[model samples]
Target: SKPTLKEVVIVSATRTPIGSFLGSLSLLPATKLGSIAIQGAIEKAGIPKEEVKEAYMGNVLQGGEGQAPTRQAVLGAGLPISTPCTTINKVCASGMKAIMMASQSLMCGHQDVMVAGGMESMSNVPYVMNRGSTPYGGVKLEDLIVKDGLTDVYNKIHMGSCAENTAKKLNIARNEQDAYAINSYTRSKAAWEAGKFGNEVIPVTVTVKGQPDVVVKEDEEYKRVDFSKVPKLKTVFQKENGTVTAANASTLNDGAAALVLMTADAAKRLNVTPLARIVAFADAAVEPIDFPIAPVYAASMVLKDVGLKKEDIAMWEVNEAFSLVVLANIKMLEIDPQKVNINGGAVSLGHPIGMSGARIVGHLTHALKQGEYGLASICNGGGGASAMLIQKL
Candidate 1:
């Protein structure tokens, strides 16, 4: 017997209360929250604190430490210092990549158990001062000839602009985008109210004026469907009749999410009932010019790799980096809209890019635990995307 795909399993998964950027979660550094989330997950898994064979963490903006944010997060979480750790950067796929790497290592006999997670405080993601922008500064940035004569990476195109172009070209009207955004809020709110998220979130205590310091452990920024105020929102990110806007997009938010995973044998040894098992995951790439449609390609790439048809997945999470990102994906893949983002996505919720991947895993794990299998995918900014397929085990 070939040991059969190694049966990598998700033992435990948890995330902190996701707060609006500089809104509520801004109170701490990404590292602080990232570390705590890891600890919380490990503690919940009921695995011996000393038995974790290794740790893997992911980050996008290497704000605090340049090379070793993962190790820094584990240590900050007060985990055993003697354990080894590795960190990675995969744009939006950071967290899932970490989990993928950890599972691969465990299955390959590099280790028996591990902690895999990601964290980001966009609240602290600095708008880096550009040294490269001044490469031929004697002339000025205005003098440079960009790739398309449209604009360079910095000035005329933020990722937001690309999404606007996609939405307009795809004919996703403004009202449709707003309706989607509102639905995300309502679904996530319902998920919480129904106690789906209550137990999974670890409350963190913070001080506020007049009120005693309260530990906010749940998602904090759901507006109760203010369609009247939101409907009148002006278009953003496009010069033409674009459907994308700030309100229809995920805000710059701060959040930390983590999960506990282990080799099949290790999970059994730890006496932890498996929450889910990995089916397959893959990362695909393409040129930046076709970024809007990237996730669809990525998902197709993953389906090809796994030898599974798109219909096999019961739940899908294509990160809503832009309303168009997910919308484009559903159209291209010919997936049911009601199936993807069955809950709201980043546009209505928020996207802390680095943490977004992990957040999906966390939510997917939760959804799977709710008796349905799930698959998640994310298309990132710099011309890449990642997809994962899993099932309740």
Candidate 2:
């Protein structure tokens, strides 16, 4: 019999507590946040630093200024200088794409140990002076952060407007979105109060007024939801009869997330317990204006790739870029609301773009540990999406 290929497994996954972009973590650099997440994941995996063979990190919005941020992070995390590191950019799916690349390396026997993750500091995104070297005169500056990060070039539409499109296409109502938004906040608050995020998040230390630096152990965006005002919030995109609202949408934030992946056999050799086994991964695309529903395509593709049905999944973490986005996905994919984003999602938390792709996978692993199987999927800018399936070991 031919030798069986090794099974890819995630040994550890963790993230730093999220900070509102330009809010709490505004002073921190993206590289330092990436280093924090990478180092925390390494420590949790209990692996010798030298054993890591590769590092793949996702980042966006630092174009034309910073060079080799991922390299900076790896070295800062105390990893061996020789370890190869690559920074991936796939918009919102960047982090999960990094994980997929690392997993492929493990399965192909090119690497036994790899660290994969993504980081973003939206506060640090800077304005651009296009062709500042122009001999004639000063060119009007453009907000590259908003132009590149938030708008779809091909669709000529803002992401929030795309959410509105999805809502309208699916006939999702404003009331439906507000109720879901409220539910997301309520569930996230309850989860926080119950200490459910303790294992998944690492505290970030920040200076405080008239006091020593204090560690922020919880997500900075969570607060008591004002149910009365949630429905009354102003519509942000397509305000003329649009269903999308700021209350139902994700906020720009800063965070870093990482996962340690290796083959099951490698985990055994290293004497490390595997947290979850990879079953499938898929990437898909659709019209740019239909971006919010891209995850639905990816989720369907992954389920087919893994020879599983929707009902087989014990939990789901479909990225809630917007309440309408998640509601439309649940309606289209026939996913159970209770099984999806059980602990709440980006509306209550925040979306740190690159970080969220991998964050959901990490969160799903923990949720499925008590169950059987789970899947995580997220939509990206530029009409893209990524999905992955993981089963409890």
Candidate 3:
């Protein structure tokens, strides 16, 4: 007989302001970013550090980072050394998968409280050289960010190229993609102007050389786009009449996001209010070239498992790995455009590979109204996707 799953609730969620490539946060390693977000989430939840029994963090570019990044984050955040930790890497879906694993552990009665999220510093990812038997030959160095994070290993193509394939297959035109991108930028700007992200964001402080300390409190990519130049921008993946462009594709970024999760009984015993309740989660996959549409399967599976319809969801966050990714998902899933990414998406906010999966879940918790259901889904590089459903408390 199968054991009954325990109820899991998220008490707090927080993220550092996303920094563009070689931008303000370039100096900090991914582990440090993870620690900051984890610490902030713990403090926001008002839970004792000792109560955190485990930790799970996602990171894709770990080439130069030290061993056990998750353990480093747990200790750096002042959690007890006894807390067991694991680092996950599911390409772009790392963070969300970490949260799903944490929930599974809770439901299995292995632990009562846990911290889960993802972090990535694309700017800090280092190039590595392999040693060859012949010392006289020249050495070749590979950029881990491109090799490990951005490329679809199975198809051996840049993710952007895959997006181009998706665009052609799904019938998403250049004009439609550009229009969607503009809306993303507009919504992000409006949300920032209205201070909609204040609660979910944690200000990150950076020390500059021979300069005053700076606090980064806002996402950088949303403000960098120049709308007038968007249409004229050259296609990056395929130069000859291709739809994918730098403006429509998600930008590389550095950031981290974390959440505190515990059993419903633990929440009551601790007298803490939860932000949301985890209803169900699912993972799906398709052909490597068709990875962009994976979220449709994952989200549908989640909704089906929970006996909920598309109309039952009040909000949806489909990670914008590329404009085509979201556009393809919307068309295939028949999702209402008005109910999706109201605060913009990775197209405008920046995609910090490992951190985006968990970031969407955190954002959904804050964006949804009480008792409203929300869904978060993201496609990974290796033809897989993860979807999660949560109801705001």
Candidate 4:
């Protein structure tokens, strides 16, 4: 067996309440939301704010939001301006990449304390204007917001198509996808009602034009869904013989998630109890159209790197960018369904692109009890995915 981690301790993991696109959080920029999660996690860390030496945040759709989004977030959160920051853009895997980078900083003795996470406000992704005049000599607008965020630029193919391909390849039927979607919704509702997932959620105050400031405390996308209607919905990926549907896919959401990491010695000095310890991480890529299967490759790499088998991990958080995506991974990996995504996934809990990467880490940390290990995996927009391992403290 591989040695357990004692260096990179996760002191705190937190996330803001996920808001539906163009909903209560529409007015907030990605930087502002990122600041909220970073500040919230720092507060929960029970450590001196000055001890934080650096930060790394994941973000996509930074189109005209000014320069250095990670710097903007750290400063806005009242961290020292001298602390260096890096803004990563690995599409949906940006948040997890930030965590991996932060862990390396600790392992390499470069930083004692660090903040790592990801944030995104899809509602604020802009319609880009062509920089130069078009061939027709007129200003043209592109839906870069959704097109760039959700599609692979290399093949001009949408992520939904990738899910469709995986589903067809795995023979995942429409009924199976629909059933899994309902399972996700049920688990999410149960977790929410039991207050199992509430500790990590920080209430965000959003002020309406004419109404008083309202504090949003819960995830907006985890609704009381109608399972009967899921099968009736039309397929969204392909016109005919398609299994994916709007009901079975993740929605456009806005959120920020963060984790505070430090050396175990630092946690002991601060008398802070950590939730988990970072173990190993890996990244992998595949064909653009087969992007949905990227997590399997990444997860396999990390498990082999750490000398662990699929059965060794107590919990799994395979992100549900689409229901078929999760089904395909579960089948191919031969993982027990009960141990995978126990509290739902992006299909129900929401996927705010960059945020979901770190969000699953935070959720898994909270889900695991003492002496247990958890694995997290997420597929990105490009032909890429990321996976990481955590051991509960």
TM-score of each: 0.88, 0.95, 0.98, 0.96
Local distance difference test, each candidate: 0.75, 0.87, 0.93, 0.89
Clashing pairs in 1: 184-344, 203-217
- Model 1 is weakest, by summed lDDT over 10 consecutive residues, at 143-152
Model 3 sits at a Cα RMSD from the real structure of: 1.2
* Poorly placed runs, candidate 2 (over 4 Å): 1-4, 133-140, 207-211
Candidate 2's error at 207, in angstroms? 4.5
How accurate locally is residue 51 in candidate 4, as Cα lDDT from 0 to 100? 85
Which candidate number has the best TM-score?
3
lDDT of model 1 at residue 339?
A: 85
List model 4 lDDT by residue over 1-393, tens digit each. 953544888989999988888987889998999999999999988777788999999997788678899999999999987899999999999999999988987888888899999999888888877566567666657776667788778777678887888887889999999999999999998998999876799999987799799898998888936788998999987888989888899989999999999999988888889889898899999887888889999999999988989989999999998988888899889999999899888998788898899999999888898988899999988789999999998
Worst 10 residues of 2 by lDDT: 130-139
Off by over 4 Å in 4: 1-6, 134-140
> How would you encode candidate 1's per-residue C-alpha lDDT over 1-393 as one tens digit per residue?
646556788888888777786777787887888887888898778877788778877777665445578777888877788989887787778878888888888778888878888887776665333365444545333311122212325334767676776776788777877877777777777777788775467988877789878777677666524667778877766757767777777776777788888778887777789888887788777766456677777677777876878887888998887766776787778988878887666776677767878888888887765455688888766677888887887
lDDT leaderboard ranking: 3, 4, 2, 1
List, in order, the clash count of every candidate structure.
2, 0, 0, 0
Return the candidate ranking by TM-score, descending.
3, 4, 2, 1
Global CA lDDT computed for model 4:
0.89
Better of 2 and 4 by lDDT: 4
CA RMSD per model (angstroms): 4.4, 2.1, 1.2, 2.0
TM-score of 2: 0.95
